[PDB]
Every structure is written in C-alpha cells, then in structure tokens.
Design a protein around this motif. Structure first.
Motif, PDB file in Angstrom:
ATOM      1  N   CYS A  26      52.647  42.329  34.442  1.00 28.31           N
ATOM      2  CA  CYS A  26      51.562  43.066  33.864  1.00 28.31           C
ATOM      3  C   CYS A  26      50.816  43.418  35.127  1.00 28.31           C
ATOM      4  CB  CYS A  26      50.809  42.179  32.832  1.00 28.31           C
ATOM      5  SG  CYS A  26      49.008  42.470  32.569  1.00 28.31           S
ATOM      6  N   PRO A  27      50.752  44.697  35.432  1.00 25.93           N
ATOM      7  CA  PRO A  27      50.351  45.092  36.812  1.00 25.93           C
ATOM      8  C   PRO A  27      48.855  45.039  37.002  1.00 25.93           C
ATOM      9  CG  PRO A  27      51.746  46.720  35.629  1.00 25.93           C
ATOM     10  CD  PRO A  27      51.047  45.861  34.568  1.00 25.93           C
ATOM     11  N   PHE A  28      48.140  45.340  35.892  1.00 23.88           N
ATOM     12  CA  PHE A  28      46.713  45.057  35.918  1.00 23.88           C
ATOM     13  C   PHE A  28      46.474  43.577  35.937  1.00 23.88           C
ATOM     14  CE2 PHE A  28      45.388  49.456  34.155  1.00 23.88           C
ATOM     15  CZ  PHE A  28      45.661  50.014  35.376  1.00 23.88           C
ATOM     16  N   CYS A  29      47.413  42.756  35.470  1.00 22.37           N
ATOM     17  CA  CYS A  29      47.206  41.324  35.568  1.00 22.37           C
ATOM     18  C   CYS A  29      47.097  40.862  37.005  1.00 22.37           C
ATOM     19  CB  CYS A  29      48.265  40.532  34.822  1.00 22.37           C
ATOM     20  SG  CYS A  29      48.145  40.604  32.988  1.00 22.37           S
ATOM     21  N   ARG A  30      48.058  41.270  37.819  1.00 21.46           N
ATOM     22  CA  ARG A  30      48.032  40.904  39.237  1.00 21.46           C
ATOM     23  C   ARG A  30      46.761  41.394  39.907  1.00 21.46           C
ATOM     24  N   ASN A  31      46.343  42.624  39.616  1.00 16.30           N
ATOM     25  CA  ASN A  31      45.190  43.196  40.193  1.00 16.30           C
ATOM     26  C   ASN A  31      43.934  42.383  39.854  1.00 16.30           C
ATOM     27  OD1 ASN A  31      46.716  45.312  41.383  1.00 16.30           O
ATOM     28  ND2 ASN A  31      46.166  46.734  39.764  1.00 16.30           N
ATOM     29  N   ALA A  32      43.868  41.926  38.630  1.00 18.80           N
ATOM     30  CA  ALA A  32      42.759  41.105  38.166  1.00 18.80           C
ATOM     31  C   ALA A  32      42.771  39.744  38.828  1.00 18.80           C
ATOM     32  CB  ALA A  32      42.828  40.970  36.630  1.00 18.80           C
ATOM     33  N   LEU A  33      43.955  39.120  38.881  1.00 22.29           N
ATOM     34  CA  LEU A  33      44.077  37.838  39.512  1.00 22.29           C
ATOM     35  C   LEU A  33      43.703  37.858  40.987  1.00 22.29           C
ATOM     36  CD1 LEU A  33      47.371  36.550  37.943  1.00 22.29           C
ATOM     37  CD2 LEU A  33      45.114  35.656  37.473  1.00 22.29           C
ATOM     38  N   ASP A  34      44.012  38.956  41.644  1.00 21.80           N
ATOM     39  CA  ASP A  34      43.668  39.133  43.053  1.00 21.80           C
ATOM     40  C   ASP A  34      42.177  39.170  43.266  1.00 21.80           C
ATOM     41  OD1 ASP A  34      46.333  39.264  43.856  1.00 21.80           O
ATOM     42  OD2 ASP A  34      46.383  41.399  43.980  1.00 21.80           O
ATOM     43  N   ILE A  35      41.414  39.761  42.342  1.00 19.11           N
ATOM     44  CA  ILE A  35      39.958  39.696  42.435  1.00 19.11           C
ATOM     45  C   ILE A  35      39.436  38.227  42.346  1.00 19.11           C
ATOM     46  CG2 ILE A  35      37.798  40.391  41.303  1.00 19.11           C
ATOM     47  CD1 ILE A  35      38.860  43.138  40.749  1.00 19.11           C
ATOM     48  N   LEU A  36      39.845  37.522  41.296  1.00 17.23           N
ATOM     49  CA  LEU A  36      39.401  36.193  41.031  1.00 17.23           C
ATOM     50  C   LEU A  36      39.890  35.257  42.099  1.00 17.23           C
ATOM     51  CD1 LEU A  36      39.987  36.219  37.120  1.00 17.23           C
ATOM     52  CD2 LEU A  36      37.763  36.420  38.422  1.00 17.23           C
ATOM     53  N   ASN A  37      41.119  35.448  42.633  1.00 20.36           N
ATOM     54  CA  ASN A  37      41.647  34.580  43.645  1.00 20.36           C
ATOM     55  C   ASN A  37      40.929  34.693  45.017  1.00 20.36           C
ATOM     56  OD1 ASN A  37      43.404  33.523  41.633  1.00 20.36           O
ATOM     57  ND2 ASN A  37      45.235  34.652  42.335  1.00 20.36           N
ATOM     58  N   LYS A  38      39.984  35.600  45.134  1.00 26.52           N
ATOM     59  CA  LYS A  38      39.148  35.623  46.324  1.00 26.52           C
ATOM     60  C   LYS A  38      38.172  34.412  46.359  1.00 26.52           C
ATOM     61  CE  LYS A  38      37.354  39.742  45.576  1.00 26.52           C
ATOM     62  NZ  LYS A  38      36.226  40.714  45.837  1.00 26.52           N
ATOM     63  N   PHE A  39      37.932  33.747  45.223  1.00 25.51           N
ATOM     64  CA  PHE A  39      36.860  32.773  45.144  1.00 25.51           C
ATOM     65  C   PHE A  39      37.473  31.357  45.054  1.00 25.51           C
ATOM     66  CE2 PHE A  39      35.170  36.768  43.639  1.00 25.51           C
ATOM     67  CZ  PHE A  39      33.917  36.802  44.121  1.00 25.51           C
ATOM     68  N   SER A  40      36.727  30.330  45.413  1.00 23.52           N
ATOM     69  CA  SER A  40      37.204  28.954  45.241  1.00 23.52           C
ATOM     70  C   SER A  40      36.401  28.380  44.081  1.00 23.52           C
ATOM     71  CB  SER A  40      36.985  28.091  46.502  1.00 23.52           C
ATOM     72  OG  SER A  40      35.684  28.291  47.040  1.00 23.52           O
ATOM     73  N   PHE A  41      37.108  27.792  43.107  1.00 25.37           N
ATOM     74  CA  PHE A  41      36.514  27.260  41.906  1.00 25.37           C
ATOM     75  C   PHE A  41      36.460  25.737  41.865  1.00 25.37           C
ATOM     76  CE2 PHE A  41      38.296  31.475  40.972  1.00 25.37           C
ATOM     77  CZ  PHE A  41      37.190  32.057  40.419  1.00 25.37           C
ATOM     78  N   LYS A  42      35.507  25.206  41.117  1.00 27.37           N
ATOM     79  CA  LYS A  42      35.452  23.780  40.833  1.00 27.37           C
ATOM     80  C   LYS A  42      36.690  23.360  40.091  1.00 27.37           C
ATOM     81  CE  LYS A  42      30.506  23.402  40.572  1.00 27.37           C
ATOM     82  NZ  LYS A  42      29.952  24.743  40.442  1.00 27.37           N
ATOM     83  N   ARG A  43      37.013  22.076  40.206  1.00 27.78           N
ATOM     84  CA  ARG A  43      38.131  21.555  39.399  1.00 27.78           C
ATOM     85  C   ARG A  43      37.934  21.827  37.917  1.00 27.78           C
ATOM     86  NH1 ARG A  43      38.697  16.576  36.779  1.00 27.78           N
ATOM     87  NH2 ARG A  43      36.763  15.867  37.694  1.00 27.78           N
ATOM     88  N   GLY A  44      38.961  22.384  37.297  1.00 21.62           N
ATOM     89  CA  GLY A  44      39.022  22.657  35.858  1.00 21.62           C
ATOM     90  C   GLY A  44      38.213  23.889  35.413  1.00 21.62           C
ATOM     91  N   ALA A  45      37.598  24.533  36.403  1.00 23.53           N
ATOM     92  CA  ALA A  45      36.716  25.679  36.121  1.00 23.53           C
ATOM     93  C   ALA A  45      37.384  27.037  36.105  1.00 23.53           C
ATOM     94  CB  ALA A  45      35.535  25.677  37.101  1.00 23.53           C
ATOM     95  N   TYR A  46      38.685  27.110  36.306  1.00 25.80           N
ATOM     96  CA  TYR A  46      39.460  28.364  36.352  1.00 25.80           C
ATOM     97  C   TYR A  46      40.871  28.105  35.826  1.00 25.80           C
ATOM     98  CZ  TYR A  46      41.830  32.498  38.467  1.00 25.80           C
ATOM     99  OH  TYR A  46      42.547  33.656  38.641  1.00 25.80           O
ATOM    100  N   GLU A  47      41.280  28.851  34.800  1.00 26.15           N
ATOM    101  CA  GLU A  47      42.616  28.671  34.230  1.00 26.15           C
ATOM    102  C   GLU A  47      43.260  30.013  33.967  1.00 26.15           C
ATOM    103  OE1 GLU A  47      43.078  26.298  30.571  1.00 26.15           O
ATOM    104  OE2 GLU A  47      45.261  26.506  30.695  1.00 26.15           O
TER     105      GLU A  47
END
Length: 110
Positions: A26-47
């Motif tokens: 899902c090509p917009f999926c990767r694009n979206a994940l790439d935005i969110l993957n710029k950040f570091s999240f607390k444990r259990g705070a990102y799924e």
C-alpha cells in the motif's frame, strides 16, 4: 465464530498512543510510515497494525468508513481519534504541527 471489526480496531487504540492500520503493499502506507518513523516513541505508544489479520476485509472497510470517513488504509489514529489517511498526515507535517501534536498526546520519548 467472528470478531467484529469494531473490536479489532478499538482493542488497539489507547489515549496516549499512535495506531496506524496498514497493508503490506500500500504505497501511501509506506509514505505515511516514513513520516511517523521520523520520531522516537515511548514504549507501547506506537503500533503498526497489519489489517490482513482481519477477515472479512469488507467488514473492516465498512467500519473504518463509519468512524473515519474513509474505507482504505492507511488509517491513522492519534489517541482514540481518527486523523484520516496519508494526505491528512502529510498536511499536519507540512504545517510543522506534527511535533507539537505528538508532544501533547504524550507519545514521544524525551
């Protein structure tokens, strides 16, 4: 004999958590994940939730439509609130509002 789409979605949401529902390809999926993957999240705070774990697909599409206004992945949730899809997220990023929103909702590692 049958988990309801509503339970599949809502079991994975939490007040101080980002949940994104995706499919493998899902090509917009990767694009979206790439935005969110710029950040570091607390444990259990990102799924990242693979929707191929749910059948039938149409029941989950129909549920996403009712509570997010759209049927297809990615579907992004900041807390229990639907943000929408890729261009919704991109719009927040482009406004440089995403870091502030992520800070407010308590998901960022500091």
């Amino acid at each position: 004999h049958h988990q309801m789409a509503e339970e599949f979605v809502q079991q994975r949401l939490a007040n101080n958590k980002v949940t994104i529902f995706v499919k493998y390809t899902c090509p917009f999926c990767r694009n979206a994940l790439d935005i969110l993957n710029k950040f570091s999240f607390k444990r259990g705070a990102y799924e990242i939730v693979d929707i191929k774990e749910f059948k039938p697909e149409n029941e989950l599409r129909d549920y996403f439509e009712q509570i997010t206004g759209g049927k297809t992945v990615p579907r992004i949730f900041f807390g229990k609130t639907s943000i929408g899809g890729y261009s919704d997220l991109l719009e927040i990023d482009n406004m440089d509002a995403l870091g502030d929103i992520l800070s407010s909702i308590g998901v960022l590692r500091t």
